[PDB]
Design an enzyme around this catalytic site. Structure first.
Site, short mmCIF file in Angstrom:
data_model
loop_
_atom_site.label_atom_id
_atom_site.label_comp_id
_atom_site.label_asym_id
_atom_site.label_seq_id
_atom_site.Cartn_x
_atom_site.Cartn_y
_atom_site.Cartn_z
N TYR A 86 49.66 -6.75 51.94
CA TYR A 86 50.30 -5.57 51.13
C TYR A 86 50.56 -4.50 52.11
O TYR A 86 51.02 -4.80 53.18
CB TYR A 86 49.59 -5.23 49.97
CG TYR A 86 50.34 -4.66 48.70
CD1 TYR A 86 51.67 -5.03 48.19
CD2 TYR A 86 50.35 -3.22 48.36
CE1 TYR A 86 52.17 -4.45 47.40
CE2 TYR A 86 50.92 -2.78 47.31
CZ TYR A 86 52.11 -3.36 46.90
OH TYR A 86 53.03 -2.78 46.06
N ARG A 139 60.73 3.96 46.88
CA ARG A 139 59.35 4.02 47.46
C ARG A 139 58.83 5.36 46.85
O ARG A 139 59.22 6.29 46.91
CB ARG A 139 59.71 4.23 48.97
CG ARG A 139 60.61 3.35 49.65
CD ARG A 139 60.07 1.74 49.50
NE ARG A 139 58.76 1.46 50.06
CZ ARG A 139 58.51 1.23 51.10
NH1 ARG A 139 59.48 1.16 51.96
NH2 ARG A 139 57.31 0.91 51.63
N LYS A 157 52.43 -7.02 44.94
CA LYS A 157 51.54 -6.37 44.23
C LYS A 157 50.83 -7.64 42.84
O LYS A 157 49.79 -7.34 42.55
CB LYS A 157 52.11 -5.30 43.45
CG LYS A 157 51.31 -4.29 42.64
CD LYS A 157 50.38 -3.36 43.38
CE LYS A 157 49.71 -2.20 42.74
NZ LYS A 157 49.43 -1.37 43.69
N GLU A 228 55.58 0.14 40.12
CA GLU A 228 55.19 0.19 41.50
C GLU A 228 56.14 0.94 42.53
O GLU A 228 57.60 0.48 42.35
CB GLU A 228 54.83 -1.39 41.79
CG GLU A 228 54.18 -1.30 43.37
CD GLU A 228 52.82 -0.66 43.32
OE1 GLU A 228 52.23 -0.35 42.45
OE2 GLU A 228 52.22 -0.68 44.56
N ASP A 229 55.96 2.02 43.34
CA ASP A 229 56.76 2.45 44.42
C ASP A 229 57.95 2.85 43.96
O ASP A 229 59.08 2.84 44.74
CB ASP A 229 56.87 1.01 45.32
CG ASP A 229 57.06 1.50 46.81
OD1 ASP A 229 56.42 2.43 47.30
OD2 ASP A 229 57.42 0.69 47.62
N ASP A 251 50.45 2.56 39.10
CA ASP A 251 49.37 2.35 39.77
C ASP A 251 49.36 3.48 40.93
O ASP A 251 48.24 4.38 41.02
CB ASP A 251 49.03 0.91 40.56
CG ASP A 251 47.95 1.07 41.28
OD1 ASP A 251 46.98 1.35 40.56
OD2 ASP A 251 47.92 0.82 42.62
N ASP A 252 50.48 3.91 41.30
CA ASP A 252 50.55 5.09 42.68
C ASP A 252 49.68 6.36 41.77
O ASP A 252 49.16 7.14 42.55
CB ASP A 252 51.83 5.09 42.90
CG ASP A 252 52.73 4.28 43.68
OD1 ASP A 252 52.08 3.59 44.51
OD2 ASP A 252 53.84 3.99 43.27
N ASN A 399 48.45 9.17 54.24
CA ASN A 399 48.79 7.92 54.76
C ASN A 399 50.14 8.19 55.46
O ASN A 399 51.09 8.89 54.91
CB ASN A 399 49.18 6.97 53.60
CG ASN A 399 47.94 6.31 52.85
OD1 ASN A 399 47.08 5.75 53.44
ND2 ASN A 399 47.65 6.42 51.70
#
Ligand SMILES: COc1ccc(NS(=O)(=O)c2cccc(NC(=O)c3cc(F)cc(F)c3)c2)c(F)c1
Ligand SMILES: COc1ccc(NS(=O)(=O)c2cccc(NC(=O)c3cc(F)cc(F)c3)c2)c(F)c1
Lengths: 544, 544
Positions: A86, A139, A157, A228-229, A251-252, A399
Site C-alpha cells: 500500500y 487523492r 485497500k 478511499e483517497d 478511512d482517511d 506525510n
C-alpha cells in the site's frame, strides 16, 4: 485446472499422494513444502528485488497464482510488506505501472454508463459482498491525480481488509468511479485508458456517485462502502451526504482520527500528565487536523467522563497566521472557531505568530504535528516542552517523512529518551546510552479492517460516529500493561487478526445497543461474540 | 470469465457493443483499442523497463492475460524482442528468477515417477500436440547447469514455434526431464524445488529418456520431439539413439548447421569466389564445428552437384594444436579425420600452429569462427584474407559477443566494407565513407519453426537428414535478388511466417518423395501446398 484457480491452488504444498489423486503429478517440481516453507521461499524471492515497485510486481504475481500463499506471506512479514502493498508503493504502481492491475477484479464506472450502474454490478456476479472500496483517483493529499489508474488504490485497500480482518477475498470489490482527471500527462497520453476529460463539476459528480450508492445498496446490500483517497473538495461533503442513508465511511477522515486518538490517550497515560493537565499544540488547522483534535476530546470524554468543554480547552490550534484566538481580528473558518482560544488578548495574539513564540507562551506538554510544512518542531521548541513536562508527547504525523515535523531520532536525542513519539511511518529503533526507543506507528490498519468485519457481521443500517468512537476506545484498551511498560501506544501490528476481531466485537456490541444491527444470529455478550467473530474470519491457511 | 481465459481474452479490443453483450461492461477501462494500438501500448510498457529481465517479466504478464496480444507484440518487434524472450535473457530468468515459469504449462519428469511417464502425459489432457520441447537443463554450452529450472528454456523455445511458424499455442508442450543437477549453489539452496542430487549416470539417464520417448510416441503421436540445450556428453548420442525410431531432432546441432550453411552459400554467391575456389579456415574443431562444415559441403553438393569430396578439400580445420593434417603425428579424434589435410608435409604441419601463420600459409578466402576462445581474427589476419579475395567471408559465430572471433564493425573497417559478415548475435549497422553495412544474423529461428510446422502437417515417421538439408536449401533460396543486392544472406527475420511456411512446404515435399509422410490429406505440388500450409498456421489476430 485446480492449479489455475488461485483460491484453491496450493502449488508445491500439494503432497505426493494429493498430486497423484488430483492428476497433477508432473505439473509441479517434485519438492513438497508446507505453507510456512512456501512463505519463507516467497519472502526471499521478494527481498531478491531492491526496488519497492519490483517487490510489489513479484507479490502481484504470487497473488494471481496462489491467494492463500500471498496473504500468508503478508501476515508473516506484515510491518515490512505494508509500505510495498500500500502507501507509498501502490500510488507509484498506479501512476507509472497501471498494467499491474489489469488482471484484478476491478469495477469501472463513468458517465458513459449512466443508468446502467446496477446492471454492471449484477453482471459482476459476486455473492454476499461484504466490503466495497471506491475512489475517483482525486487523492486525499491532492498530489498525483491518478484518474482511472486509481483502481489500484481500491485493489490495494481491499487487500488490507482481507489481510487485517480476514474478509474473505471473494467478498471484497474494488471500484473506480472515473469522473475524469486533471492529470495533464494523462490527458495527453496515448496510453491512458480512462475518460480523457477534466474532472466533472459537482452536480454531475453527485449524479453519478448517487447512482453508485443506490445501485450498491440494492445489488450489494450486505456491503460496507468505504471512500478511499477522495480530495478535500468532496471527501467531507460525501460523508455528510451519505453517512445516515447508506452503510459507509471514509478511512482517511474517520479511520485516521480513531487510530491517532487511541494512541494519544495511551501517550497521556504514560506521560504522567493527565488529560485535563495536557496543553496540546495542534500544529496545523485544516479540517482533518481539527477532526483529529475533536476525536481525541470525544474519546477522553467517553473513557473518563470529563466534560468535553474542558477537554476542548486543552487544545491550542495553530494555522498559517499563528495561534487561533477569538481576539486576533480575522473571520475564522467554521472548523477553527470551536478550538479558538477565548483566554488570549488581541495584544498577545499579535505576538503569537511563529511556532517558537507560541510554544514559549502556551507552555505545551504535547506537540501534535498535522502541519504538512516540514520540520517545524526544532531542537529549541522540543527543549521548551521539556520545561513543561518530564515526558513530552511529540506526534510528527505529516506525510511523507520529508513533511514530518521532527524525526523520532531527534525527538529522543533532544529529550534524552523522555519523548513519547507516534509517527505516520515506521522508523527503526533509536538507542541512547544503551536504552532503546522506537516510535509507535499509528497505522490506519489498526481500525478500518475491524470496522469492516464488524459492519459485515452486524449489517448495521448505517455507521454513526458512535461505531468509530467505540473502535477508537477498543484499540486504546488493547494496549496491555506489558505493551505500555515497553512504551508501546498500540498493540503490536503483527497481532492484527486478534486486534480486528476485538474492534469488530466492540463495534457489533455498539450497533446492538443502538438497535441498528440487522443480523439477529450474533451473540450479544462480549466473550461469546469475540469467539464467534474469530471463527467467522477467513484465514490464509490451506483448508479445502 | 472470458476475460480470465488468456486464449480468447481481447482486453480493451472488446468493442462497447461486445462488452454489453458479454456482460463485461465495467470490467475494463472505457478506451476501445485495435490490436495494433494494444501492441504499440505494450511495446511502450516494455521499453519503460531498462533491464532485459524486467522486460521479460512484463511480457510474461501479458502472455498470462492475453496470448494473442503477446504473440502480436513479438511479431511486430521480433528482432528487438528475440534477445529478451530467449537467449540470453531466458537463461538468466531460469538461473535467478525461476518463479517466472511457475504458472506456465510445464511437464516435469524425474526418476521418482519412473513407469508413470505415460500416465503423467495422459493426465496433462492435451489434444493433438504438434511440438514438444525437452531439456534436462545440462546446457549445450556447458555453462550454468539449471537442473529443474531448465523448464524455462523449454517454455521459451515452445513460444518461438508459435511466433515463428504459427504452431497453435494450445498444441505445444514444454518438458523438463530432471535427472539431477551439478549446480553446487542449487544442491545447497533451500529454495531449489528440483531433484537434489548430482546428475544420474548414463545408464539411468537413458532408462528415463527412453521411457519419455516411448510414452510421448504413444500419448502425443502427432508431436515432433525437439531436444534443446543438452550437454555435449549426451546431445549427439541422443540423436544417434532416437533419430530413426521417433519423430525428433536437436535444434542446437541440426538447426544451427542448416542456418549457417544457407547463409554461407549466399556469402559465396556474393563473394565472386565460387564454392570450389573457396579456401575455408574452420577455426575450431569440436563436433559442432565439423558438423557445420559437413552441412556446408552437403548443401553445396545438393544445390550444385559438385563432388562432395572436392567440397571437403576446400576446408582447413584448426584445433587447439593448429592446422589438422594427416602428417602432424598425433592420433586425430574421429570427427577431425574427414577434414584432415592430406596435402601438407609433417615439416609444414610443425610450422602451422598459430592462427596467423596458418592463414599466411593456407591463403584462405573465408574465416569461419567456431572457436569459442575470443577475438582470434586480428587486423593482420583479416588484411591477409584481403590478399586472397576482393570479398573476404568472415563469420564470427562464437557466443556470446565476448567469445566472438571479431566484431562486424572491425571486419568492415579493416576491409573498407569488402567483408561479407554473418554473426550469431544482432549488431547495429556500420557506416564507412557514407556507405552502410550490417551483418546477417544466422538466427536458429529461420529453420526450427518451419521444420516443426512441416513435421506437424506431414506427420513423417522420423526426421532424416534429408529434411534438414531441404530446410537449409529452402532458406538459402528465399534470399531474393533484391536481398542479395543489399548484401543480405537471409530473407528478413520480420518475414518469419512466410519463411516458415516455405521451409515447411519444402520439408513436406521431401517427406512425400521419401514416402515417410503419414498425412495423406496434403497437396503434393508446391504452389497448392504453400497456400494450404499458410492457411493452417495460427495467427496472432483476434478471430473468435
Ligand atoms: C510469482 O508467482 C509465484 C507463484 C507461486 C509461488 N509458489 S507455489 O508454491 O504456489 C508454486 C511453486 C512452483 C510451481 C507452482 N505452480 C503453480 O502454482 C501452477 C499454477 C498453474 F495455474 C498451472 C500450473 F501448471 C502450475 C506453484 C511463488 F513462489 C511465486
Ligand atoms: C501485463 O499484463 C497485461 C495484460 C493486458 C494488457 N492489455 S489488454 O488490452 O489485454 C488489457 C488492458 C486493460 C485491462 C485488461 N483486463 C483484462 O484483460 C482482464 C483480465 C481478467 F482475467 C479479468 C479482468 F477483470 C480483466 C486488459 C497489457 F498491456 C498488459
Amino acid at each position: 485446472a485446480i492449479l489455475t484457480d488461485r483460491y484453491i491452488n496450493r502449488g508445491t504444498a500439494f503432497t505426493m499422494e494429493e498430486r497423484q489423486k488430483l492428476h497433477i503429478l508432473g505439473r509441479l517440481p517434485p519438492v513438497v513444502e508446507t505453507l510456512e516453507e512456501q512463505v519463507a521461499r516467497v519472502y526471499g524471492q521478494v527481498k531478491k528485488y531492491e526496488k519497492p515497485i519490483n517487490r510489489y510486481q513479484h507479490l502481484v504475481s504470487v497473488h494471481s497464482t496462489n491467494t492463500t500463499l500471498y496473504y500468508a506471506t503478508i501476515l508473516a512479514h506484515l510491518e515490512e510488506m505494508l509500505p510495498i502493498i500500500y502507501t507509498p508503493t501502490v500510488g507509484e504502481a498506479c501512476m507509472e505501472y497501471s498494467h499491474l492491475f489489469f488482471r484484478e477484479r476491478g469495477v469501472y464506472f463513468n458517465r458513459l454508463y449512466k443508468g446502467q450502474f446496477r446492471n454492471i454490478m449484477r453482471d459482476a456476479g459476486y455473492q454476499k459482498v461484504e466490503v466495497v472500496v471506491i475512489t475517483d483517483g482525486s487523492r486525499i493529499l491532492g498530489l498525483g491525480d491518478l484518474g482511472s489508474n486509481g483502481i489500484g488504490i481500491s485493489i490495494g485497500k481491499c487487500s488490507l481488509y482481507v489481510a487485517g480482518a480476514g474478509i474473505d477475498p471473494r467478498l471484497i470489490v474494488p471500484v473506480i468511479l472515473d469522473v475524469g482527471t486533471n492529470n495533464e500527462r494523462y490527458l495527453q497520453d496515448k496510453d491512458y485508458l480512462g475518460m480523457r476529460e477534466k474532472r466533472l463539476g459537482d452536480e454531475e459528480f453527485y449524479e453519478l456517485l448517487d447512482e453508485f450508492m443506490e445501485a450498491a445498496s440494492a445489488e450489494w446490500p450486505n456491503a460496507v462502502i468505504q471512500f478511499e483517497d477522495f480530495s478535500n473538495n468532496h471527501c467531507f461533503d460525501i460523508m455528510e451526504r451519505y453517512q445516515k442513508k447508506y452503510r459507509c465511511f471514509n478511512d482517511d477522515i474517520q479511520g485516521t482520527g480513531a487510530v491517532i486518538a487511541a494512541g494519544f490517550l495511551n501517550a497521556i497515560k504514560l506521560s504522567g500528565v493527565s488529560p485535563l493537565q495536557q496543553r496540546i499544540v495542534v500544529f496545523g488547522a485544516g479540517s482533518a487536523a481539527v477532526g483529529v483534535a475533536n476525536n481525541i476530546a470525544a474519546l477522553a470524554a467517553r473513557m473518563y467522563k470529563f466534560p468535553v468543554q474542558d477537554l476542548v480547552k486543552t487544545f491550542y490550534l495553530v494555522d498559517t497566521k499563528g495561534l487561533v484566538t477569538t481576539t486576533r481580528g480575522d473571520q475564522l473558518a467554521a472548523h477553527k472557531k470551536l478550538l479558538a482560544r477565548t483566554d488570549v488578548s488581541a495584544e498577545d495574539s499579535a505576538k503569537l505568530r511563529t511556532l517558537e513564540e507560541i510554544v514559549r507562551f502556551v507552555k505545551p506538554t504535547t506537540l501534535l504535528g498535522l502541519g504538512g510544512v516540514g520540520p517545524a518542531f526544532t531542537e529549541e521548541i522540543v527543549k521548551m516542552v521539556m520545561q513543561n513536562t518530564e515526558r513530552p508527547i511529540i506526534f510528527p504525523l505529516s506525510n511523507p517523512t520529508s513533511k514530518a515535523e521532527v524525526t523520532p531520532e531527534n525527538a529522543y536525542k533532544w529529550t534524552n529518551g523522555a519523548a513519547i513519539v507516534a509517527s505516520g511511518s515506521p522508523f527503526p529503533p533509536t538507542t541512547i546510552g544503551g536504552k532503546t526507543f522506537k516510535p509507535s506507528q499509528g497505522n490506519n490498519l489498526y481500525v478500518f479492517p475491524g470496522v469492516g468485519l464488524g459492519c459485515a457481521l452486524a449489517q448495521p443500517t448505517h455507521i454513526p460516529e458512535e461505531l468509530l468512537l467505540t473502535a477508537s476506545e477498543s484499540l486504546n484498551l488493547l494496549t496491555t500493561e506489558g505493551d505500555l511498560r515497553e512504551g508501546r501506544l498500540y498493540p503490536p501490528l503483527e497481532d492484527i487478526h486478534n486486534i480486528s476481531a476485538n474492534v469488530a466485537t466492540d463495534v457489533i456490541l455498539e450497533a446492538q445497543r443502538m438497535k441498528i444491527d440487522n443480523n439477529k444470529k450474533l451473540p450479544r455478550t462480549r466473550d461469546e461474540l469475540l469467539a464467534f467473530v474469530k471463527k467467522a474470519m477467513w484465514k490464509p491457511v490451506y483448508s479445502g
